[PDB]
Amino acid sequence: ARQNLKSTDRAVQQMLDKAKREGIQTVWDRYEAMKPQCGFGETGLCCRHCLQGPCRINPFGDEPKVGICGATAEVIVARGLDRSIAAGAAGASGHAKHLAHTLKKAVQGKAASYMIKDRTKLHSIAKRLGIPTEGQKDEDIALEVAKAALADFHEKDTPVLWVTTVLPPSRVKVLSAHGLIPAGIDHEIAEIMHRTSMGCDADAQNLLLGGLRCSLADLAGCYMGTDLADILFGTPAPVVTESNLGVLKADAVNVAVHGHNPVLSDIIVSVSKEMENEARAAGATGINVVGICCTGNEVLMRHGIPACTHSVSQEMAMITGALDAMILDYQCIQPSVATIAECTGTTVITTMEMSKITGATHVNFAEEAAVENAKQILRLAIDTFKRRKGKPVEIPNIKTKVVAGFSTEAIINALSKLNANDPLKPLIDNVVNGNIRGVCLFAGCNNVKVPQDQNFTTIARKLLKQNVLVVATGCGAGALMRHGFMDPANVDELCGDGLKAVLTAIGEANGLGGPLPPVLHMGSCVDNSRAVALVAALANRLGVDLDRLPVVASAAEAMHEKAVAIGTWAVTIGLPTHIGVLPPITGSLPVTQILTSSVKDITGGYFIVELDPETAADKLLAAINERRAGLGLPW
Amino acid sequence: ARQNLKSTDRAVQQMLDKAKREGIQTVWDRYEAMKPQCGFGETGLCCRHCLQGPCRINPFGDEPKVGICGATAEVIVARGLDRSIAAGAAGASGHAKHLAHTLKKAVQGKAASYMIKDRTKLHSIAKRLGIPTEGQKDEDIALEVAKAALADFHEKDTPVLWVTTVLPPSRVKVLSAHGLIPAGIDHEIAEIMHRTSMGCDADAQNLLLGGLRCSLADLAGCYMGTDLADILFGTPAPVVTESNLGVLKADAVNVAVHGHNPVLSDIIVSVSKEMENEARAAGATGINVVGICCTGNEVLMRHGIPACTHSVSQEMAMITGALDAMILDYQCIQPSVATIAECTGTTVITTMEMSKITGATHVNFAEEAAVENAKQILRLAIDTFKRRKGKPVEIPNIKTKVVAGFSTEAIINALSKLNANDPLKPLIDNVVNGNIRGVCLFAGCNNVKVPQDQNFTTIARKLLKQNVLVVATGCGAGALMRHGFMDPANVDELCGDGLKAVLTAIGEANGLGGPLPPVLHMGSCVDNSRAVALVAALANRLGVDLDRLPVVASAAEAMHEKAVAIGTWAVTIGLPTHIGVLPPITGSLPVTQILTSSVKDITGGYFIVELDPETAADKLLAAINERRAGLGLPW
Numbered sequence A, B: 001a002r003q004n005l006k007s008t009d010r011a012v013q014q015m016l017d018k019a020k021r022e023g024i025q026t027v028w029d030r031y032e033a034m035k036p037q038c039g040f041g042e043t044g045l046c047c048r049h050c051l052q053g054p055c056r057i058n059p060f061g062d063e064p065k066v067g068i069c070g071a072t073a074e075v076i077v078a079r080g081l082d083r084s085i086a087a088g089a090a091g092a093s094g095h096a097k098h099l100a101h102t103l104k105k106a107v108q109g110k111a112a113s114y115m116i117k118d119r120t121k122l123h124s125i126a127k128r129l130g131i132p133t134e135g136q137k138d139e140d141i142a143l144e145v146a147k148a149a150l151a152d153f154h155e156k157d158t159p160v161l162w163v164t165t166v167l168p169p170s171r172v173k174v175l176s177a178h179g180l181i182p183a184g185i186d187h188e189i190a191e192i193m194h195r196t197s198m199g200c201d202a203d204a205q206n207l208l209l210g211g212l213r214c215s216l217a218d219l220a221g222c223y224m225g226t227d228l229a230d231i232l233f234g235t236p237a238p239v240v241t242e243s244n245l246g247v248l249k250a251d252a253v254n255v256a257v258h259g260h261n262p263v264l265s266d267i268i269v270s271v272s273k274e275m276e277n278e279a280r281a282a283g284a285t286g287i288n289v290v291g292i293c294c295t296g297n298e299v300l301m302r303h304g305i306p307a308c309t310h311s312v313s314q315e316m317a318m319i320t321g322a323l324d325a326m327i328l329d330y331q332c333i334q335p336s337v338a339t340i341a342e343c344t345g346t347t348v349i350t351t352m353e354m355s356k357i358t359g360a361t362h363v364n365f366a367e368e369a370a371v372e373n374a375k376q377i378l379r380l381a382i383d384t385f386k387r388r389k390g391k392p393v394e395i396p397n398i399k400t401k402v403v404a405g406f407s408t409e410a411i412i413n414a415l416s417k418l419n420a421n422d423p424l425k426p427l428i429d430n431v432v433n434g435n436i437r438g439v440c441l442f443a444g445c446n447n448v449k450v451p452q453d454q455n456f457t458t459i460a461r462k463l464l465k466q467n468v469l470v471v472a473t474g475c476g477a478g479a480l481m482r483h484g485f486m487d488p489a490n491v492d493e494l495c496g497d498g499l500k501a502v503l504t505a506i507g508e509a510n511g512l513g514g515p516l517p518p519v520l521h522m523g524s525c526v527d528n529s530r531a532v533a534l535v536a537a538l539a540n541r542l543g544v545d546l547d548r549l550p551v552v553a554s555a556a557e558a559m560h561e562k563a564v565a566i567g568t569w570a571v572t573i574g575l576p577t578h579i580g581v582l583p584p585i586t587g588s589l590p591v592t593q594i595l596t597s598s599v600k601d602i603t604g605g606y607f608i609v610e611l612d613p614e615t616a617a618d619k620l621l622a623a624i625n626e627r628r629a630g631l632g633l634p635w
Ligand code: SF4
Pocket: A047, A048, A049, A050, A051, A052, A053, A054, A055, A067, A068, A069, A070, A071, A076, A197, A198, A199
């Protein structure tokens, strides 16, 4: 088998060969067994929203042409897309809500493993929300912030403040004029599910406007999640670590944290240190915590925990034979891990009540008992390490160097070394003079349909040569880090001369004797909100709205409903937004035309659907350069 | 074409012949064009929850056997079912929330077309919720009730009170022990959408427990909707009217109200009276308001507005040529009505922001302007009547007599004429002595897969002969009313001797010189909550939980996600619950076993999946008789 057709990651290729000779079925094998996939679902021309279905519509030819109730292709496609947006927003809702409850418990004395670690961020958030801080105790300010977070989930006398206070007034005004500001996060999710049920909304434009509004509920959940996690766990600052499977160590207890909400896995990191001597008593060198997916990104950004792998290739960490435990919260966890565990000697542990996997051990995490829970979990991992005494393992000796931790605060701080009282100005100066052509945010997942990482790296390489400042989150950051795009030693090879000059100037003013890395890692999927903060700050500093800035986004290998929601809010806030896999819209030309063209007249953003990555890079560069021209800049 | 294979309603058959010769496509034609339907969707073995899909699993044979991410058939089936429950609950959320806002506006002086019409119900609801009434103005009590309603949508220091205050403490205790009490209505909807997204919950039992809890969020929305509509519009009492297409009048302006939330259509009824002389100036005899679907049931129950048709046959009202306007809110409206309108000369009008139909005129209803909006709408209808001057119409001269209005308060009042201070006792006496074998609630829709009404009438006939007290809501009530089951003149033919004796005794004590009708119409789909109130009151009076009572439910021709949610909460509160169409569960035996068998050990209720109505009636009778035996009663 030509494993490079499955993944461009050489460590993944090595583990695919091991899985093949050991007869362990992988995600790629399950994909092959699924082909050919249903074309009605692929194009969006299937509806199961009532028990008269399934209804399907032929993309072309003869009947069926319309759903049983009369729903047109337009309506079916838009309703399906809307439910995907609501599902994505629901995951942001759950993640942010859990942190809000954790912060409230911490300051009420109910969860002493948690605390206010970033008091400055707490006060800034409170100020942004309009909560008084002068003369108030930090615990009372934090209680008010947590109450405000919980209030944004339902209707009240204000709209969702984690939208209206984080975008510039001119953008809020555009959105309000179109009725797009969410009334409440869970309120919008429920309204989507209602309006898309049988015999309700049946006008494509009306449906899609509802979807844009629900996507902003996802944005609010993202921003709230980042805000609360920074209060609780610290705002990221620049870190150096490593990525890929070679970060596993045969002689250590290897523990992966996997999922998205790091609420317990930030605790796992701290407790794992305490238990070093206990792990050594078991014959290990220590506990080696490694990251998978967003939870991995969270602890990478804040603590420099090395990232083992991401998204589509997550099973491969287990195939090494050296993964003693995989500690799960929720989201993006292939449930195959529970069955593979029996073959590989990994202990798979679930921790959240609403995310269990048949066959995996469940340990009831509670903030109130977080240290206790962590010790129970890590002792299972130590037990598992002991059971593999004397078993060879196959860890690919493949890893990259990763500089990360570029929160928006960290980026502004780095720029302030060039201009202390106007830190965005050096960035803008270099956009104006062409040393920085524009900004591209890579976001979202890998997808088994695309050879792993191929779109991210192909597009990033062409943008970097054209002097684009590239920022990344989620498993887009994962793809780029595992291929060396976060190692400053690769700036000469990857970057155009103008971009190299800027990364070098900033790095040398931050005492590095060397440049910033080719790509700036801005964190997890909720931390796409950090990219919003940066872009909104640039818009404010320039006095223009986001749809005039040379800033684009690319969900180059999108998979999860979360990625559909993110792409939709990127469009809603004003960005040209590439998606590199086909969303289920091509069965309706009118819906496609709205999402790729006429939405420009509503929000200024628009989708760019392009599966060929070289072509996508050209289209993204054209979008950037069109924005440059609109600002009167050379390009 | 043998139209009796499509509908057992003879008026519908006549209009199907008219549609055929005029070349107007109907729901039945669109169904035929859809056959054969996809077996993966039919069985539940399809997933589109991420962009790696669609994934499908062969019910039997070879690969594919598992989803791409590892999701098993169990997981796929349970996730799909859970999303359907959440969608149903979301419609109850929207409906109830709109009424809560209407009540709040009314008592704040912001919507003078609305008012407190049932002060006694207001005070009783307040007492049930724990809101003080002594010394308080009605407007302040109502503000507190509306605030409490809105609070049940989100988490707070109490669970959802429209669950915990409406079921007996022993039932609440059972549900709480299993973690099934909702934390908030929209909170549960969002948690379902999260947990069912890719890489989250992947254990069938855990998923289905979440679904049971979300179904109780639907129950809360139903009960809240009924409570608030009774405050605003009056609690139903016994009414006499008519049903079927013969209620249309060629010489009148015929206006159908269609959808579910009657917030404007209760106003349409009152304003239509005011405009009699204006309609007469246009050459009509008056404005003839008629009902379709739940909104029709609402105005039938409160005002005796005749019901034109229901559910699957709704297009046939238009085919007569005499329907001048169809006034829509949301839910259960086939969007085909907008295109048929061009053929039939009907003006189709949408009124709610989140439910538009391409090609239909939209009129922006606002409580604040309700009378103004109603006049605008009715003037469009008058204009349309004038355009059909001199056009023949074909109204089938087919109608039945309907006695309805059996709210739980009305039933208790009727029984109190036999026992003033213990009004449930005469009902219980007759259950004990066998004159009443048990109670069956018919609920939910028609479904194009089932010859219209055939399951409702076949099952009802066999239960009535076996002395079952039959109550009905929604388009189950619609089916039964259109076939004479709400006409007391049919008691001799339909009812067993014991049931006849009871209906006669109650009727003769209420001054009727004649029995109650064979079936008691308890209202719209949210008014399934009234059946809960009756059953909970019987449980309380007997000192037993609902899972010991000889009470069953039947969604005999279910269609909408709403009907899936209702069936699931019927099971959750303890009832044997028949469903007469196949829900998408048969692709997983473990899920089927949970829903039809092992849930008995959790809630005491269970699904009975049976597509053959004679067999379903036997299974429902066996369920009733098993409950009788458990109470020590003869059967
Ligand atoms: S909502 Fe309409 S299109 Fe969808 S399954 Fe039901 S009948 Fe078919």
